[PDB]
C-alpha cells in the first residue's frame, strides 16, 4: 500500500485514545489488537473494534499524503505518539509489512496486518433517526448506567434500554434489584421504538461525549445503533432480546413520602455502611414523625446508628435496604433535596430529586 501521512501529535492523541476504547486487554486474535488506518480524499480514518462495536475517528490532512490503508498495534502506536514531545510532527509511511513512524530523530518500525483482514460490522439500514445535544445524551446515560446489570444471566439486562416516545428519549437500566429511568425532550416527533444497547457500548458512547456545542446524530436500525459527534462515529450491534417494563416496578399509590437533604442522607448511609454485613450490605431504616433512624449490624455484632431530622408525615415503618444501592442513587442525584416514596416494608421504593422529576430511581427492599 502507498499510505503516507504527516500530522501534528496534538491532532492525533484524542482520535487514538477514542478509537482504542473498544480494545480489550487480551485480544483473542492479533488483528483485534490493531487499529485500521486509512488515507483517502485528504482524510485519515482510524478504526478500533471488538467485533460487537466499532469506533471511527476522522482527521483532516493538510500536509502532503498518499492514499492507502494498513492495521497497526493500537497500544504501541498510541504510546509512541503520547511519548513524543508536545508539538511533535508525526510522519507515517509503509515499508513492506512494516509501518514507519518518524518524528525528529525518533524512528519506530511497527509490524502490520493487511487492512483487507480488518473485521467490518455488516451493512444495515437506519429505521429511526434523531439529533440531540451531547449534554442531553450524557445526562440520560450518566443518570442510569450504574443500574445496568454487569454479568446477569438475563443477558438483556447487561445493557441499557433506549426508548423513543412522542418528543422524548428515555433510558432504562436495571439489574433486577434496582432500576434507573431518565427521560429528556428532544424537540422532534419520534415513532415509538425501543432498543437495548450492550453495556460495553453504553460506556463507549458515554466516554465519546464531552458536552460541547456539537450535536449528536443517532441512527437506529433493526440490529444496530450509530452515534455521530464531530469527527467521531460509534456503531454497535444491539442486544437481541425483550427488555422488561419499567412501569410495573413504580410504586402504584405511595402513601408515605420522605424528604431529606441529599448530602446529609448520603453521609449517614456511608458511615452506617462501615458496620453493615460485607456481603449483603443491609441497613435498616426506621421512619417516624420527621425522623429517620438508620441502623447497620454485621456478623461480628458491631452496630452503627444514625439519626436524622427529615420531613416525614406518614405511619411509622421499618424497611431494609442494600446500602450500596441507596448510595449509588444518592451519588447519581446531584441535588440538594431528595424525595423517597414508600408503601410498606416489602414493596419497592421510588427515589428522586425533590425538585426535579427528570430521573427516577427504584430500589427493591431487603427483608428484615
Amino acid at each position: 500500500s502507498h499510505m503516507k501521512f504527516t500530522v501534528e501529535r496534538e491532532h492525533l492523541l484524542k482520535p487514538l485514545q477514542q478509537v482504542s476504547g473498544p480494545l480489550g486487554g487480551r485480544p483473542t486474535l492479533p488483528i483485534l489488537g490493531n487499529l485500521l488506518l486509512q488515507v483517502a480524499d485528504g482524510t485519515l480514518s482510524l478504526t478500533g473494534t471488538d467485533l460487537e462495536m466499532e469506533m471511527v475517528a476522522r482527521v483532516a490532512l493538510v500536509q502532503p499524503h498518499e492514499p492507502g490503508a494498513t492495521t497497526v498495534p493500537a497500544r504501541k502506536f498510541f504510546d509512541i505518539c503520547r511519548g513524543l514531545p508536545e508539538g511533535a510532527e508525526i510522519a507515517v509511511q509503509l515499508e513492506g509489512e512494516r509501518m514507519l513512524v518518524r518524528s525528529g530523530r525518533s524512528r519506530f518500525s511497527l509490524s502490520t496486518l493487511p487492512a483487507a483482514d480488518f473485521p467490518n460490522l455488516d451493512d444495515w439500514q437506519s429505521e429511526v433517526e434523531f439529533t440531540l445535544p451531547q449534554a442531553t445524551m450524557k445526562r440520560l446515560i450518566e443518570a442510569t448506567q450504574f443500574s445496568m446489570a454487569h454479568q446477569d444471566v438475563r443477558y438483556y439486562l447487561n445493557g441499557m434500554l433506549f426508548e423513543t416516545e412522542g418528543e422524548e428519549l428515555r433510558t432504562v437500566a436495571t439489574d433486577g434489584h434496582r432500576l434507573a429511568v431518565c427521560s429528556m425532550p428532544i424537540g422532534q416527533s419520534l415513532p415509538s421504538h425501543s432498543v437495548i444497547v450492550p453495556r460495553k457500548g453504553v460506556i463507549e458512547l458515554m466516554r465519546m461525549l464531552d458536552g460541547g456545542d456539537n450535536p449528536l446524530r443517532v441512527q437506529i436500525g433493526s440490529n444496530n445503533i450509530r452515534a455521530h459527534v464531530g469527527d467521531f462515529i460509534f456503531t454497535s450491534k444491539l442486544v437481541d432480546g425483550r427488555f422488561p417494563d419499567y412501569r410495573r416496578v413504580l410504586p402504584k399509590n405511595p402513601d408515605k413520602h420522605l424528604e431529606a437533604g441529599c448530602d446529609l442522607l448520603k453521609q449517614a448511609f456511608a458511615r452506617a455502611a462501615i458496620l453493615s454485613n460485607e456481603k449483603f450490605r443491609g441497613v435498616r431504616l426506621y421512619v417516624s414523625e420527621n425522623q429517620l433512624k438508620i441502623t447497620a449490624n454485621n456478623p461480628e455484632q458491631e452496630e452503627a446508628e444514625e439519626i436524622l431530622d427529615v420531613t416525614y408525615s406518614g405511619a411509622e415503618m421499618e424497611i431494609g435496604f442494600n446500602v450500596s444501592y441507596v448510595l449509588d442513587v444518592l451519588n447519581a442525584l446531584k441535588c440538594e433535596n431528595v424525595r423517597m416514596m414508600l408503601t410498606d416494608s416489602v414493596s419497592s421504593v421510588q427515589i428522586e430529586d425533590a425538585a426535579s422529576q427528570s430521573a427516577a430511581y427504584v430500589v427493591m427492599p431487603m427483608r428484615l
Binding site: 436495571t174 433486577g176 434489584h177 434496582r178 432500576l179 410495573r248 416496578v249 427493591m364 431487603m366 427483608r367
Partner: peptide
C-alpha cells in the same frame, strides 16, 4: 434482597 417484579 427482594427481586423487582420484572
Amino acid at each position: 434482597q427482594a427481586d423487582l417484579x420484572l
